[PDB]
Structures are given as structure tokens and as C-alpha cells.
Design a binder for these strands. Structure first.
Ligand SMILES: *OP(=O)(O)OC[C@H]1O[C@@H](n2cnc3c(N)ncnc32)[C@H](O)[C@@H]1O
Length: 646
DNA sequence: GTCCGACTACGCATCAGC
DNA sequence: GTCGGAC
């Protein structure tokens, strides 16, 4: 058949008959791109999962070995996260490859990509070089995926030119809508509306409806034929939960897909279980906007409150053989980053401990002062090839959960149990390995003082977790089972700044057409200058963003006003007449190496920016001169508890 | 509530142009 | 990291 007319969203989809490729033959990338079209067209997640499941069903029945690349293409992933593969292709490089492939000038394609907010639309609607040669052989799914890995593997000098040539070869072989999705994949903005959770749902539904390991033609193609609506409903969720719980234990398609294709979904938890050395998905936290919101949602269930430390999450694995591994919250290998940690594993556990998986937070520590250092100090550590002698920023560990212990998994255990084992079999070495400052209560005043004390002790806020009711480490049940209580979540903390809009940025994707971001500035009275302080991109409603785009479009200037100073900040696409004042909330103030706001008032060669800036409201009663001054910004930074604890 | 994709600062690691 | 939108 023709991959051009592939419709994986048709009613009564047959995996074998409605396919556009013969069995044993490699899956054409156009079939993947056609499935991406139908997925992008709809907004309901259930319709998106069904369309993908249909494509996965034809793959599992006609070309099983192509299931792994098709899943990775739908996720826009290069492979397992612990392998650390990265494309290494910037937007400027992708645009240079698009311009060279289409025969157009770089300025033409760059203006169009910014105006459209999508590189895929530019790379597709340009084929002035396709009428130059005979059509290259059609693209395959596994072939496109391997070429993506080829790009990611090129390193060293002159590697950029080699990446461009591979991207160029893909575009000249693209037909119909393939160029739009290949360019979207390289830029890291697939924009499908479907991601990890929906792919997992589509995979479990596809292998349940069309089981793998069958002979061809497949005896079973729709195992939900003789079932009722509520029966097929509850059967698919039970199957989807088996896949989701094991993927949370082993988020590695390279390990799950082969076992899946050989033993089926039923026997998967027997082969892929939680084990040290293999990173697992961490437990996340849902943001709570107040103490009262914690009493609800948890209702009549006992919980605990722990200090929210400002560092980097460290998932530490101790294998039975003695080898030690550390993983980030994205399952990235961080073992070579903490040699100081590895030397101290003996000092944290009892002689009876043989294997464990620890959930801790690596926080920068000052041994000469016995205090916690801010996150900016922690980020100055080296990332790889670190030798313990040259470690200049010490790290203190704050363990708050225990997942594995002596060969048994505690995932299905309540937090009250996991916390107990973590206390009995681990030792306190202050400034090295300490337990999270905990406090079990239900008193609002006690919780309020604990929230205050945490920030006095160089912490962001509190973490609230139940102890016995829904207090397991099963992410597939609820990925955000913990609660997050910070000061800036409450609407009275007062860290609101009134800043002037001095620039706008063209939006991409969901923000194509209007402004996606804005440049904010503070007024320096002594220099009579507006100093850029940060960029702003979140906090607007969709209706507010169109009001800003309309109101600020009249103030667009061809050149910046002479009294505006942005230093090394990103030059805005549209310079704006300094007139709009917006209220902006942030979590912290940081010493910036780029922004010139309040430079000299705290550090001689560094300014101040805002950590996690968000838009609150427009200050219509205010004018640029009445905005927050750089002197106020310098004082706000000084009054910070971590800055005061210095 | 869930899932997804807009967008933030920052600094190490990497590479093009000279 | 924060945030809002569609379901
Ligand atoms: O805001 P966020 O989602 O990054 O917060 C979650 C992260 O916060 C870190 N952290 C610090 N202290 C704790 C405690 N006591 N418990 C759990 N997490 C904690 C972690 O890095 C977490 O991912």
C-alpha cells in the first residue's frame, strides 16, 4: 500500500489489513509521521493513545524488531537516560542544515522559523532542491533512529559539519510530512501533545489487544472482542499498571521491550524488578499553596514534615558486590561526579548492610563554618572525571527515603517502615551524612514554626508525606504523592518585585504568533538607567498573554532607548518603550554573571537576577520611575537567610 | 487531578573561528 | 524549576 494514505486513527483499525507495509519489512518513517499527524490533530489524550496503540499494534504484528525505535521516536528519546546520549545540535545548526537542504539563505529560514515558531513548518514547505535529483530511497523508522544516534555520537573538532551533513541527508530523503517531524525532533520540540505517560498507555494497550510472540498471520489481533465496555476498561488499566509500575522500577526500554516481546506483559515483573545499579524513577512532589491545603488532600491521615534542602537529588545504589553508583533525578549517571561520596559510603551504614538504594539530597557544605551553602555554590563542582583530591566544594548528604535494603525491595512498604529501616541501619555523621530534619505532628502552629525554622536553617520550605495511608514508593499509582510547601507559594511572603518591561521575545509552539517571553529591568537611580534583571515567561494566562501582545506591540522600538542596559542578556526580538510595570514574584535572588541589575552594590563584577520569576499582575498605577530600584534589589538579596548565614 | 508543553537562572563542558 | 490549558 501507500504510506502516504496511512490512517492509524480510523474506526475499526486492523493491525494487518490497515497497515502500509508488508510483514518482515522495516516500518516506513512516513507511517510514523502519519501517526504523528493524527496525534497532533486531536486534543483528547484517549484519542491520542488509541492512534499510537494502533501503530504499535501493526508493528508488534508485522515488524517486531522495529518496536524499540518507533517507541523512542514517539518519545523523542535517543535511548536510556543513564547512557547520556545527547544530540549536540543547536537551533542555529539545525537552521543552517535546513537552509542548505532547501537551497535558501540562512536569514530567510531564520526569519520564517521565528515568525512561525516552528522549524518543522519551514523545513517541510521548502523543496526547491527536491526537483533537482531523483527521489532517494524512502526513510525507515529504524534508519531514521540510527541516524539520530549517529548525530549524537559525533564528537570533537569539525563534528558540527558532520552533524549537518547527516541532517541534510535526512531532509533530502524526506517526503510529505517527514521533514516537519524530523526537524521538530532535532530541535527537541516534537509538539505532539503525547509523551511518556501516554506512550506507556499506548504500549500496554497495543500488546494487550495484539499480543506479541505470535505466528503470522496473527491468531489474535484484538483480545478485547468478546468483552463489555466496563470489562475491557478495567482489563486495560490492570495491564497498563503492570507496565507502568515496572517502568518506574526500570525506566529502560532497552531492557523492557526485549523481555516484553518474549514473555509478554504478564511475566514482565518477574524479569524486570528493582535492583541496585539500575536507576529508578524518583518520587515527585505536588506544590501546595498553604498549610490548610495540606490538611485537605491528606484528610485524616497522619503525615510527617521534613526540611526541603536546596541541593541536587542523589539516588545512591550500593550493590551486593560493594560497587557504588549514584544517579540524578533524570536517571543520569552521577557516579564520577561525587568521588568524595564514594569514599564515605563505609561511614554511613552498619556492618550488617549488604545492599541498599538511598534517596538523598546532595547539599554543598562549608566545613570551616559548619553551615549549608546555597545551590549556586553546589553547581560550581565538576561534572565528570573528578578526582577526590581536587574536590573544592564539599557535599553533605541528607537522606530522606530508603528503597532497597539487603536484597529486598521496600517499594510497596509504607513510609513509616522505610523511615524506620533507614534509621536503624544508618549512622549520623554530621556535615557528611545526616537525616532530614523531621517533625511528625498535626498542629498548625507547630507546622508554621517548622516552616519558618527551615528557611532560617538555609532551606526552601517543607516536604509533607503521609506515613501509613497511601505512603508507598509506587510512582505508577501517583507520581506526585508528596507535597511541597514553600514560602513563595503563600500570597503574603512579600518577595514581589515591580519591574519594567523593556523587551519581548517571539514565542514558539504553544506561543507561536505572540510573545513567549519578556525582558524585565530595574531602575538604577544613581546611573539613571534601567538595568535588565531577568526574563519572564510564566505566570500569564492565555488571555493575558494576548492582551500583553496587543498592548505592547504599539511600544515596539527599532532600537533600544539610550538609558537601557542589558549587558550580556539575550538581545530581545522586539525592543519596547519602557512604560509597562508588572508585579513579579520569585523564590530567591541570585548573583548573576550576565544581568547588570544592581551590579556593584553587592558584588564588584556581578549583578543580581531572580530565581524562578513568575508574573502576578500588571501595575497600572505605576510608571517606570516608581518601579523597584536596584538599591531595593541589593537589599532584598542581602536579607536572604542563606546570604545572612554567611 | 493528570498529563503535557509553554517558559525561568546558572555554570560546567564543548567547539567554531581565528 | 513555575505555570496554565484541555480533558
Ligand atoms: O521543587 P522540587 O520538585 O524540586 O522539590 C523536590 C525535590 O526537592 C529535593 N528535596 C529536598 N529535601 C527533600 C526531602 N526532605 N524529601 C524529598 N525531597 C527533598 C529533592 O531533590 C526532590 O526531588
Amino acid at each position: 500500500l501507500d504510506p502516504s494514505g496511512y490512517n492509524p486513527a480510523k474506526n475499526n483499525y486492523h493491525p494487518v489489513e490497515d497497515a502500509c507495509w508488508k510483514p518482515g519489512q522495516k516500518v516506513p518513517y512516513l507511517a510514523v509521521a502519519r501517526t504523528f499527524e493524527k496525534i497532533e490533530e486531536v486534543s483528547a489524550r484517549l484519542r491520542m493513545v488509541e492512534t499510537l496503540s494502533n501503530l504499535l499494534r501493526s508493528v508488534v504484528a508485522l515488524s517486531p524488531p522495529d518496536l524499540l525505535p518507533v517507541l523512542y521516536l514517539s518519545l523523542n528519546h535517543l535511548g536510556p537516560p543513564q547512557q547520556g546520549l545527547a544530540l549536540g545540535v543547536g537551533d542555529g545548526v539545525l537552521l543552517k542544515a535546513v537552509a542548505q537542504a532547501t537551497g535558501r539563505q540562512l536569514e530567510s529560514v531564520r526569519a520564517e522559523a521565528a515568525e512561525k515558531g516552528d522549524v518543522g513548518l519551514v523545513a517541510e514547505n521548502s523543496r526547491s532542491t527536491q526537483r533537482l535529483m531523483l527521489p532517494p530511497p524512502p526513510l525507515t523508522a529504524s534508519g531514521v533512529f540510527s541516524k539520530f544516534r549517529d548525530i549524537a555520537r559525533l564528537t570533537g573538532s569539525a563534528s558540527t559539519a558532520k552533524k549537518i551533513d547527516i541532517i541534510k541527508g535526512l531532509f533530502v530523503a524526506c517526503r510529505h510530512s517527514e521533514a516537519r517531524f524530523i526537524a521538530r525532533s532535532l530541535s527537541g520540540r516534537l509538539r505532539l501533545g503525547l509523551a511518556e505517560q501516554s506512550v506507556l498507555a499506548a504500549l500496554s494497550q497495543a500488546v494487550s489487544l495484539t499480543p506479541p510472540g505470535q505466528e503470522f498471520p496473527p491468531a489474535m489481533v484484538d483480545a478485547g472482542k468478546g468483552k463489555t465496555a466496563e470489562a475491557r476498561k478495567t482489563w486495560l488499566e490492570e495491564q497498563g499498571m503492570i507496565l507502568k509500575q515496572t517502568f518506574c522500577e526500570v525506566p529502560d526500554l532497552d531492557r523492557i521491550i526485549p523481555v516484553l516481546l518474549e514473555h509478554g506483559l504478564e511475566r514482565l515483573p518477574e524479569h524486570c524488578k528493582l535492583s541496585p545499579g539500575i536507576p529508578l524513577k524518583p518520587m515527585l512532589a505536588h506544590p501546595t499553596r498553604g498549610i490548610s491545603e495540606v490538611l485537605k488532600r491528606f484528610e485524616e491521615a497522619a503525615f510527617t514534615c521534613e526540611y526541603k534542602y536546596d541541593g541536587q537529588r542523589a539516588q545512591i545504589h550500593a550493590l551486593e558486590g560493594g560497587e557504588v553508583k549514584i544517579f540524578s533525578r533524570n536517571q543520569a549517571d552521577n557516579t564520577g561526579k561525587y568521588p568524595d561520596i564514594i569514599s564515605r559510603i563505609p561511614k554511613i551504614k552498619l556492618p550488617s548492610v549488604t545492599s541498599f538504594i538511598l534517596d538523598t539530597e546532595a547539599v554543598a557544605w562549608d566545613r570551616e563554618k559548619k553551615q549549608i551553602q546555597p545551590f549556586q555554590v553546589l553547581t560550581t563542582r565538576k561534572r565528570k572525571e573528578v578526582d577526590a583530591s581536587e574536590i573544592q566544594v564539599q557535599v553533605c548528604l541528607y537522606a530522606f527515603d530508603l528503597i532497597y535494603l539487603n536484597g529486598e525491595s521496600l517499594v510497596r512498604e509504607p513510609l513509616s517502615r522505610r523511615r524506620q529501616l533507614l534509621r536503624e541501619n544508618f549512622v549520623e555523621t554530621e556535615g557528611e551524612f545526616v537525616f532530614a530534619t523531621s517533625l511528625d505532628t498535626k498542629d498548625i502552629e507547630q507546622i508554621a514554626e517548622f516552616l519558618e525554622q527551615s528557611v532560617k536553617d538555609s532551606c526552601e520550605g517543607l516536604m509533607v508525606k503521609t506515613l501509613d495511608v497511601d505512603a508507598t514508593y509506587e510512582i505508577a499509582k501517583r507520581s506526585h504523592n508528596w507535597l511541597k510547601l514553600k514560602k513563595d507559594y503563600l500570597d503574603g511572603v512579600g518577595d514581589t518585585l515591580d519591574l519594567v518591561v523593556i523587551g519581548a521575545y517571539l514565542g514558539r509552539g504553544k506561543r507561536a504568533g505572540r510573545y513567549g517571553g519578556f525582558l524585565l529591568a530595574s531602575y538604577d537611580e544613581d546611573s539613571e538607567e534601567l538595568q535588565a534583571i531577568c526574563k519572564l515567561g510564566t505566570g500569564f494566562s492565555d488571555e493575558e498573554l494576548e492582551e500583553h501582545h496587543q498592548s505592547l506591540k504599539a511600544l515596539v522600538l527599532p532600537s533600544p532607548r539610550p538609558y537601557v542596559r542589558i549587558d550580556g542578556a539575550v538581545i530581545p526580538d522586539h525592543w519596547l518603550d519602557p512604560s509597562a510595570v508588572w508585579e513579579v514574584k520569585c523564590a530567591d535572588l541570585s548573583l548573576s554573571p550576565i544581568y547588570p541589575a544592581a551590579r556593584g552594590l553587592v558584588d564588584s563584577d556581578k549583578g543580581i537576577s531572580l530565581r524562578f520569576p513568575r508574573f502576578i499582575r500588571v501595575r497600572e498605577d505605576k510608571q517606570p520611575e516608581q518601579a523597584t530600584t536596584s538599591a531595593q534589589v541589593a537589599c532584598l538579596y542581602r536579607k536572604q537567610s542563606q546570604i545572612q548565614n554567611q
